[PDB]
């Protein structure tokens with residue numbers, strides 16, 4: 001199983017570095033950027049410089065830069081069963097280069113999943129608009145596109161929170177989407193899913209969203225699953241309208257087979273009977289009494 005994770009532009013590079021620091025098991029990390037100094041400071045193993053004033057923040061340099069290096073991108077990606085593309089949309093490199101990265105992955109026939117953010121509203125109308133044109137182009141070359149509007153992450157951390165901390169939160173959610181999907185394959189627990197099942201729920205489906213919950217104690221299965229369903233990242237989504245649902249139960253060695261059934265029944269309660277629902281587990285030996293449920297609805301709208 002060969003899974004590659006590609007951070008594109010500055011924000012995406014910070015995200016995959018965060019995934020590298022905290023470890024996602026069984027995947028290869030790449031950083032793609034035009035800024036050579038950015039890639040030198042990055043702690044990711046594989047880095048791919050693409051491309052030949054106030055012209056870096058323009059998506060078209062990013063697109064042209066990646067069009068000029070398709071063969072370099074193609075060589076990094078080939079041989080992969082699943083590619084994840086991480087980017088903060090809104091800039092010049094991520095917004096322009098990520099859809100080229102995607103098209104290259106999908107023209108090689110790889111299951112291609114985008115996980116990207118929309119900028120905070122304080123970043124200005126211009127970056128909000130850039131981000132939306134870039135997501136539109138991205139959605140044409142990806143099997144699933146998971147969007148994270150950064151403003152939802154204020155819904156749990158308000159305050160006069162640090163700009164450092166706001167973007168650390170976006171790093172964390174990007175990592176949770178990637179790890180929620182990937183480690184169902186690379187780190188299965190008692191109930192393993194097939195790669196075919198993962199393929200069926202993500203493939204040629206369009207818009208997706210992610211939600212997560214964690215819980216402890218005798219009822220952790222029900223409360224973790226219901227916390228995921230009511231995650232603010234899923235607020236405006238009618239889970240009964242999603243054509244696909246992927247569910248990752250992550251626990252330690254103490255996962256009970258009746259807890260898996262309880263997460264399953266609770267998710268299937270809110271899911272349409274005409275959807276593809278896939279419930280799998282992941283084994284994290286250092287989780288002791290905590291149970292994580294991550295829900296990915298695909299094929300929405």
Ligand SMILES: Nc1nc2c(ncn2[C@@H]2O[C@H](COP(=O)(O)OP(=O)(O)O)[C@@H](O)[C@H]2O)c(=O)[nH]1
Pocket residue numbers: 008009010011012014015056057087088089090091092093094095117118119120123127150167168170171174
């Ligand atoms: N996850 C994450 N997102 C970021 C970070 N910094 C910026 N962003 C978001 O990414 C968007 C694009 O910025 P950036 O990646 O630096 O521009 P680019 O390199 O031209 O694509 C910004 O509008 C921010 O909303 C970061 O450190 N981590």
